[PDB]
Ligand binder design. Structure first.
Ligand SMILES: Cc1cc2nc3c(=O)[nH]c(=O)nc-3n(C[C@H](O)[C@H](O)[C@H](O)COP(=O)(O)OP(=O)(O)OC[C@H]3O[C@@H](n4cnc5c(N)ncnc54)[C@H](O)[C@@H]3O)c2cc1C
Ligand SMILES: Cc1cc2nc3c(=O)[nH]c(=O)nc-3n(C[C@H](O)[C@H](O)[C@H](O)COP(=O)(O)OP(=O)(O)OC[C@H]3O[C@@H](n4cnc5c(N)ncnc54)[C@H](O)[C@@H]3O)c2cc1C
Ligand SMILES: NC(=O)C1=CN([C@@H]2O[C@H](COP(=O)(O)OP(=O)(O)OC[C@H]3O[C@@H](n4cnc5c(N)ncnc54)[C@H](OP(=O)(O)O)[C@@H]3O)[C@@H](O)[C@H]2O)C=CC1
Ligand SMILES: NC(=O)C1=CN([C@@H]2O[C@H](COP(=O)(O)OP(=O)(O)OC[C@H]3O[C@@H](n4cnc5c(N)ncnc54)[C@H](OP(=O)(O)O)[C@@H]3O)[C@@H](O)[C@H]2O)C=CC1
Ligand SMILES: CCc1ccc(-n2c(-c3ccc(SC)cc3)cc(CN3CCSCC3)c2C)cc1
Ligand SMILES: CCc1ccc(-n2c(-c3ccc(SC)cc3)cc(CN3CCSCC3)c2C)cc1
Ligand SMILES: CCc1ccc(-n2c(-c3ccc(SC)cc3)cc(CN3CCSCC3)c2C)cc1
Ligand SMILES: CCc1ccc(-n2c(-c3ccc(SC)cc3)cc(CN3CCSCC3)c2C)cc1
Lengths: 488, 488
């Protein structure tokens, strides 16, 4: 059969714009790409470029880079750099301004991409499914608003991503999320970050860097140790170093009631029954797939837990012509994962050579201060899945920190290997440059690197990374899930 | 036969202290270690710990880290950090002071290593050879000064390293080297670095950071492009960026005569017949192996060109019981190379399991601002002895530099592959975090990584290293030595 478009992508995101571009350029198909708005902005935060560009990776990193100067300016003193250190506080207003300039600049380059690419058209509005071949674009999220466009397509691709989750406590509406955090007029003096995940830990670092005079940031998590699912020794050292940096880490604590005050501040009720006032309260509870308004039922597309889209290894839904990638599938919620999922989708339906995304042994990072760089299994998980595992560990304060005054900044590397093989199953790093090192570590790992391949490599001196090639003797072992000091 | 010691190490350096420690601790041998002095200091700069610790890797990196703050403080302004930027210059003498404290505490750490290790003893003086089994320790470098100790040994190891080379021009003795650079009480306003190698480029960066008001650093090089043997596109982009940062790169220029003025400053005559005044003039001509005073002839050990000790793959000299490692062999003059050479020497003669150092595919770095991170062949060399080579290239100005103001800071990656099989022969990087990334790149290359292994790895976003996994189509090719735009 013959229709108007070959592909209609719902969501101009990291994955969406990858599949859209590739189909249109290398295969010269006719691709329509639907998104909510053109440039970044408060009313509906996401835009052209997805969460990555608008309210995610890109702006986050810039603000984490901005916050990192607080330490660096302090650290410079030991090396001979003298200036006014008296109540040295930063300008939040000129950070957001500069941030907006860059985000908008990327918003503009994606806009001119559509004009420069034949077959690639942008369609502003709220895309929703009608049937297996028809995507309806509406004026608002409300399914009774005006119908802007009716797109007739061979294939549909859902890349609408995810949305912040909120807790069902009274006064929920008075709290902000990562979305609102980007567009705050002023940096908060009294800041509460709720949750112990990626966003919570990262933004606690941002606010702590940009807090005004005498300000403070409280991170509160409902459990024992923050960042569940990461290397426990890394998590412990990270809690210790966030503390040393100023952030008051608060475990086994959770808000139950929030009330609005007359002066503007927020009154918060906790688990232990204590009461406190915070200028802003951010919720980093996690991200649920954004698919509750797409009407997947009307096409026969299976909706799992939290609205996730049931896909096979090749991203294909219950309907043979409809596909889904990125956060909306709830597999591995990262930008480069969604991009790979998109490029694979093109290679399959329009390329002739099908490929599935390798979701295993994927190197990711946490952009806290200091940052985490990880790839592979935790020692807890590898113990459950393997006969006998060796745990290599190394901690150090870099020589420069003896001069800088930040003697709390301990670089940590922990390698988890299969004892039988020698195969590296996990590498976990904490410290500066850790997200940069973990990248080429991940090239070794999916390549199937052994611990012998590491320490036989001649090091690069002086670097933090050279320590990867100096770990030969394991600290301890796991034997059939049991922690042992030596091998029987 | 049984003698006083089974190992005498001449030179307590990176290689020396590696072989010394290992023989004494893991194999319980009686190891004597000779070095010139105990702690770092001007008269004879090198000490316990070698050049690396005292007048090399360690103090250099610290000073480069301090100089890097000049940029970071300027870059902070765009992110919202306000301060007195008016005439902001650093304190050189408090940097040197802090540097000394760190170097000294390592000198002390090595001193208490000898006291805590049995069999391992330190012998202060000038070691020289008597015969195949006897090493004489003298009061001074003059071979007629008092004989301090006479050491009787089964095996001799030469790890005396290298020494700065000087150019045979009138006024040579008025110039400093890297040695004296560490102990100048004042930072020069008018600075000339002579040469285009590692030391020249790194120290030009240091002085440029630590110059007083209205000060300038001129780097002058004998040839056309600085840093021969490195990726030509990296060198060009470095020259451009050293320029942009303040360092005046002057090529095809070489001093001919130097005279000392009455005010203290130095008058320099150049290649183009021009005259100029510099407060200090550093010679980075290179490093010749330190072997002129050891009397290798007396024992029958072959000295090659420049005085380099001729050795086989296992570091064994002309005599079966005398060995040599590190800079003194003039193979690959790096610290971690000398360490590997030392650890192998022990494994061979005391471990019973012989091993040679893999001098090929060694990842190293240049700690300029911005720094270089390299591993493997240049495209010129790979063209000279391969059938067809593919040259992958990528240049980009990181997103944060749109806010910071340093839009000259371009990150560069160039991969050079054997087109036949896809094998990566060289990876060349220029920019921040480059020496940190290149480490785990060298693990891939030692494993024999293919270009497919790179671009198949899911990236880490946002980083500079994620670009390493996004290079798929080559920019151009080399076909039987000739530069081609495509394959015929
Ligand atoms: C604060 C934050 C920081 C992050 N930092 C990192 C990081 O540093 N590194 C990393 O790897 N990952 C990071 N992530 C995760 C990453 O942003 C996501 O995994 C990635 O964006 C997923 O890509 P996607 O295409 O599936 O979703 P998106 O890129 O978000 O694309 C979804 C798009 O679909 C559009 N859309 C929604 N509904 C409709 C509809 N009704 N019709 C049409 N269009 C619609 C939206 O406007 C949105 O722009 C971060 C996330 C957050 C929230
Ligand atoms: C300024 C500078 C910066 C450098 N930076 C780096 C870097 O960042 N990364 C890197 O990998 N490499 C770097 N290097 C090179 C590196 O330091 C050397 O390659 C390394 O030190 C070689 O080790 P070695 O044991 O052979 O020599 P050394 O470590 O220098 O040991 C030689 C020792 O022998 C002693 N000795 C000399 N003569 C006698 C004798 N007559 N009797 C007894 N003892 C004697 C000396 O006192 C000296 O301490 C740098 C070098 C310099 C000069
Ligand atoms: N690569 C990167 O740099 C980044 C990646 N991301 C991605 O996007 C996703 C965004 O998640 P983000 O919000 O951190 O949260 P993610 O789920 O990581 O983390 C959620 C955190 O909130 C806690 N939490 C969950 N529910 C509640 C509740 N009801 N009350 C209190 N606390 C609760 C969780 O604790 P518990 O462990 O007990 O469930 C967990 O610590 C991540 O999964 C990640 O994949 C996001 C930011 C940066
Ligand atoms: N890994 C690291 O971070 C470091 C490693 N090192 C090691 O120590 C060694 C020490 O030497 P380092 O200063 O680089 O210099 P190296 O010899 O590399 O470089 C010397 C530079 O000086 C130039 N030169 C040589 N002779 C003359 C002359 N007669 N007149 C003018 N210029 C001359 C050379 O130019 P030309 O190209 O024309 O010959 C070259 O550019 C290095 O080879 C390196 O192996 C040193 C410092 C840091
Ligand atoms: C018109 C052809 C084209 C292709 C790719 C990009 N692109 C892209 C790009 C962005 C999004 C997509 S689709 C999600 C595809 C390509 C990013 C970047 C940023 N950086 C630049 C230096 S080389 C490394 C990458 C660039 C340059 C731009 C234009
Ligand atoms: C007495 C026990 C001992 C032995 C060696 C080191 N060491 C050494 C070391 C290096 C070379 C030698 S032989 C030249 C001997 C000791 C180096 C470094 C640098 N380090 C690497 C590990 S994490 C922090 C940074 C360290 C910590 C320390 C303790
Ligand atoms: C000769 C045996 C030796 C060698 C290196 C170290 N070392 C070193 C070390 C690092 C690099 C080098 S390379 C010259 C040498 C020694 C660092 C640190 C970290 N230190 C931990 C205790 S409190 C202060 C911080 C330590 C402990 C110690 C002993
Ligand atoms: C296909 C449409 C397109 C292409 C390229 C960019 N882009 C981009 C770009 C950057 C990030 C993204 S989101 C991953 C998308 C595009 C950057 C730059 C310039 N420079 C390159 C080196 S990295 C810093 C910026 C450019 C030119 C944007 C959109």
């Amino acid at each position: 059969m013959s229709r108007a478009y070959d592909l209609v992508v719902l969501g101009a995101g990291s994955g969406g714009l990858e599949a859209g571009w590739n189909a249109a350029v290398t295969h010269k198909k006719k691709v329509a790409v639907v998104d909510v708005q053109a440039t970044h902005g408060p009313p509906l935060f996401a835009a052209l470029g997805g969460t990555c560009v608008n309210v995610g990776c890109v702006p986050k990193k810039l603000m984490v880079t901005g916050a990192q100067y607080m330490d660096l300016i302090r650290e410079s003193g030991g090396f001979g750099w003298e200036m006014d250190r008296e109540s040295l506080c930063p300008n939040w207003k000129t950070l957001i301004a500069a941030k907006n300039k860059v985000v908008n600049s990327i918003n503009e380059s994606y806009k001119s991409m559509f004009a420069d690419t034949e077959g690639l058209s942008f369609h502003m509005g709220f895309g929703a499914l009608q049937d297996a071949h028809t995507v309806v674009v509406r004026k608002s999220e409300d399914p009774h608003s005006d119908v802007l466009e009716t797109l007739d397509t061979e294939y549909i691709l859902i890349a609408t991503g995810s949305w912040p989750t909120r807790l069902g406590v009274p006064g929920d509406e008075f709290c902000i999320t990562s979305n609102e955090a980007f567009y705050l007029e002023d940096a908060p003096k009294r800041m509460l970050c709720v949750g112990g995940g990626y966003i919570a830990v990262e933004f606690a670092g941002i606010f702590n860097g940009y807090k005004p005079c005498g300000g403070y940031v409280d991170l509160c998590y409902r459990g024992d140790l923050i960042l569940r699912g990461f290397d426990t020794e890394v998590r412990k050292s990270l809690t210790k170093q966030l503390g040393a940096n100023g952030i008051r880490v608060r475990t086994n604590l959770n808000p139950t009631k929030i009330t609005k005050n007359e002066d503007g501040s927020n009154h918060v009720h906790f688990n232990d029954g204590t009461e406190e006032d915070y200028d802003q309260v951010m919720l980093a509870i996690g991200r649920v797939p954004r698919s509750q308004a797409l009407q997947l039922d009307k096409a026969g597309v299976r909706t799992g837990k939290n609205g996730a889209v049931q896909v096979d290894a090749y991203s294909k839904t219950s309907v043979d012509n409809i596909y889904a990638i990125g956060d909306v599938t709830n597999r591995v919620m990262l930008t480069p994962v969604a991009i790979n999922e998109g490029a694979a989708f093109v290679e399959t339906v329009f390329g002739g050579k099908p490929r599935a995304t390798d979701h295993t042994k994927v190197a990711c990072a946490v952009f806290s201060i200091p940052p985490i760089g990880t790839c592979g299994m935790t020692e807890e998980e590898a113990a459950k899945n393997y006969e006998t595992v060796a745990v290599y560990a190394s901690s150090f304060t870099p020589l420069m920190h003896n001069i800088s005054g930040s003697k709390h900044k301990e670089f940590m590397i922990r390698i988890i290997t299969n004892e039988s093989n020698g195969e590296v199953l996990g590498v976990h790093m904490l410290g500066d440059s850790a997200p940069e090192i973990i990248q080429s570590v991940g090239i070794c790992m999916k390549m199937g690197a052994k611990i012998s391949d590491f320490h036989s490599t001649i090091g690069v001196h002086p670097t933090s990374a050279e320590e990867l090639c100096s770990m030969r003797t394991p600290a301890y072992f796991y034997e059939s899930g049991k922690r042992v000091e030596k091998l029987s």
